[PDB]
Design a protein around this ligand. Structure first.
Ligand SMILES: CCCC[N+](CCCC)(CCCC)CCCC
Ligand SMILES: *SCC1=CC(C)(C)N(O)C1(C)C
Ligand SMILES: *SCC1=CC(C)(C)N(O)C1(C)C
Ligand SMILES: [K+]
Ligand SMILES: [K+]
Lengths: 97, 97, 97, 97
């Protein structure tokens, strides 16, 4: 099908928005007052939290560019998440017939 | 359509909303013990991180007014998002035929 | 209707819960090494951010009771809102005709 | 039913989940530069704000493992919730008849 195969495949987009932005923000925040982001595994952690729209605060991109990227990496894991929730609704109705 | 173009539109809608709170927040907070909520280009990243419902904490309006606005600015990001979810939802439904 | 007036009514309940936990958590966090969670108008601002599950971190309860109210409110946030997402979901179907 | 019992059921299962990661977490991050993740009862309040998607910032583990775990924990919260959303949407839709 789709709603079942598509949702399963767009999470695999999520890794992309996570691994990408990590190794992207981090070379925008490499040289500067940038928080503990100047690190790649640091960033990888950030995006992870960010992905879940958590927002601990422990870290965050300060660089104008790192900042934008963020915006991207969070949309990623909400856009990505609303999908699961949408497959979920269609699946619940599939048997409601 | 609607459930597809009405969400296309509410997204484009919200963006302006973010800008609103931004220069509404920040005239509210730009004259007091307020935090970085004084400069325009900050509130931007503020309204952004606020809408997505992350809440690092790095910045956070103090004034009562800057505060309502926020309350407004959050709801925007949630409602705006809940649409895209509903849009996704039915578009999965529209493959039940 | 329902999905359209049960949501329009359940926000009222969510609004009530804020006003509830606010003047509730506050006497739980009154006396004792607790953040500004002592004032009445202080918690109110935390509810808005709590209900929507923002998590600035600027304010939060630490007393086993103070904490209980929190969890009770946030579940109200996330709840009161999944409704308006599901009001929106079905309204996007009611024009499948 | 299903969409009503399945979600009733995933909530109870989710509640049990948080506990798992909590004593699973607190053991990963109980003996190092770790914050307040050493105490069992703390982690409870950690997972709980965590699985909700809040992210106050007052605490946060950093042990690679306690961390990986967390990523597991958020997913629980959102997933668990996305259910309640699909069920609410279907229950509100099954009233069109
Ligand atoms: C399970 C808590 C729900 C958290 N949400 C969605 C999680 C997405 C990772 C955050 C809104 C992000 C648009 C919904 C806000 C609840 C008011
Ligand atoms: S938000 C208040 C404000 C005044 C002015 C000097 C015009 N700005 O640039 C901002 C938007 C900060
Ligand atoms: S979480 C590690 C831990 C060990 C023990 C003493 C059994 N605990 O009560 C906790 C959970 C704190
Ligand atoms: K959130
Ligand atoms: K959050």
């Amino acid at each position: 099908a789709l709603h079942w195969r598509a949702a399963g495949a767009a999470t695999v987009l999520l890794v992309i928005v996570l691994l990408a932005g990590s190794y992207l923000a981090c070379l925008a925040e490499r040289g500067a007052p940038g928080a503990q982001l100047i690190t790649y595994p640091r960033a990888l952690w950030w995006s992870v939290e960010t992905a879940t729209t958590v927002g601990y605060g422990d870290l965050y991109p300060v660089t104008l560019w790192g900042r934008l990227v963020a915006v991207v990496v969070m949309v990623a894991g909400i856009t990505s998440f609303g999908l699961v929730t949408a497959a979920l609704a269609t699946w619940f109705v599939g048997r409601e017939q």
